[PDB]
Design an enzyme around this catalytic site. Structure first.
Site, PDB file in Angstrom:
ATOM      1  N   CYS A  63      46.524  64.956  48.876  1.00  0.00           N
ATOM      2  CA  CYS A  63      45.815  66.168  49.322  1.00  0.00           C
ATOM      3  C   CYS A  63      46.399  66.716  50.624  1.00  0.00           C
ATOM      4  O   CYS A  63      47.497  67.286  50.595  1.00  0.00           O
ATOM      5  CB  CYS A  63      44.301  65.926  49.383  1.00  0.00           C
ATOM      6  SG  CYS A  63      43.278  67.389  49.241  1.00  0.00           S
TER       7      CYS A  63
ATOM      8  N   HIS B  75      47.776  69.271  48.408  1.00  0.00           N
ATOM      9  CA  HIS B  75      46.807  70.306  48.062  1.00  0.00           C
ATOM     10  C   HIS B  75      47.479  71.673  48.254  1.00  0.00           C
ATOM     11  O   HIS B  75      48.191  71.876  49.247  1.00  0.00           O
ATOM     12  CB  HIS B  75      45.561  70.259  48.946  1.00  0.00           C
ATOM     13  CG  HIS B  75      44.445  71.059  48.381  1.00  0.00           C
ATOM     14  ND1 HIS B  75      44.347  72.422  48.556  1.00  0.00           N
ATOM     15  CD2 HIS B  75      43.447  70.710  47.533  1.00  0.00           C
ATOM     16  CE1 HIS B  75      43.308  72.874  47.874  1.00  0.00           C
ATOM     17  NE2 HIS B  75      42.742  71.853  47.249  1.00  0.00           N
TER      18      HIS B  75
END
Lengths: 191, 191
Positions: B109, B129
């Site tokens: 992420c 992400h």
């Protein structure tokens, strides 16, 4: 008052709860702006989960139960977690009250067997983890579903760690509507 | 010795870590029989995560770092979590040592921006992400990927809460092989 729903969730956290099935709904609901109380079944001290992750409750269930009612009562799974929930008089009382006031009850994986133990939502269409099917269906008190998430009125059930995002978004949708659930879903990088 | 790999993972848990991205890998790796140490960046006391879930570490990073080396070092995301990891000299040292000994590093992420901060794995193909892409790519030290999980040698990256199961199973596969990962996957009810 406001057209923007401010909602509250009670997540009951028992020793042996499945930690993924606890944290995913808590996190996802909080992303939606739901005020979530993670309540320790036995009390306020940290709770050892099914794969030994230790989660610190916001409050004891003793204390949280007094700040009701909640818009949803959430039970995570985990075999030992579900057992503890099933043995709890305090949980029986909360579920019965929730059912009586036509409030949402959301349970996942082995979690639904606590509904069976407490005689909650008899006659509902329900799902569970595949391995919990026989336990749930003993006595034929429900109709079984293979749907990843099943919502039969105010009884919302789901199958496992892998359905936890879908389960949590279904709760968000039920409490705050489709658009809020879409907002929360958008950055999750779900399949 | 045994043909059955006994492996160890170090999960570094910082204030503001994404709790789903922490718990999913810990739980999934433990399901595989990997010995996982959840190590608190700042110390052994409970850690407040990005959506206020509080997770109690197994040990301080101080102490866990002494029990190395580990087969994988895992960094969860969360913006504040990633920031804290990026500011830590202790984390810099662990990542560098891990890279030097050709051990796996797995980050998800916003997590990969800690690799950037610590100058780890420059020239790797990496994902993050979507919202962390620009930060990661500042200075052009990596090649970007849109794959949900990306493994470039000993640098394993992934995108978000929704790729956490895939990320964790990839770690299991890298450490213990495809069959162990299939075993762990089987009851998860993943899509």
């Amino acid at each position: 008052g406001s057209h923007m729903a401010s909602k509250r969730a009670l997540v009951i956290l028992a020793k042996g709860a499945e930690e993924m099935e606890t944290v995913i709904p808590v996190d996802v609901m909080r992303r939606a702006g739901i005020k979530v109380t993670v309540a320790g079944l036995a009390g306020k001290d940290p709770v050892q989960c099914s794969r030994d992750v230790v989660i610190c409750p916001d409050a004891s269930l003793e204390d949280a139960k007094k700040e009701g009612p909640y818009d949803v009562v959430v039970l995570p799974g985990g075999n030992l977690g579900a057992q503890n929930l099933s043995e709890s008089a305090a949980v029986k009382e909360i579920l019965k009250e929730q059912e009586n006031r036509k409030g949402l009850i959301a349970v996942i994986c082995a979690g639904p067997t606590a509904l069976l133990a407490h005689e909650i939502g008899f006659g509902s269409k329900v799902t569970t983890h595949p391995l919990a099917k026989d336990k749930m269906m003993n006595g034929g008190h429900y109709t079984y579903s293979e749907n990843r998430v099943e919502k039969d009125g105010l009884i919302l059930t789901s199958r496992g760690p892998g359905t936890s995002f879908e389960f949590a978004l279904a709760i968000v949708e039920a409490l705050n509507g489709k658009e809020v659930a879409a907002q929360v879903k958008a950055p999750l990088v779900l399949k």
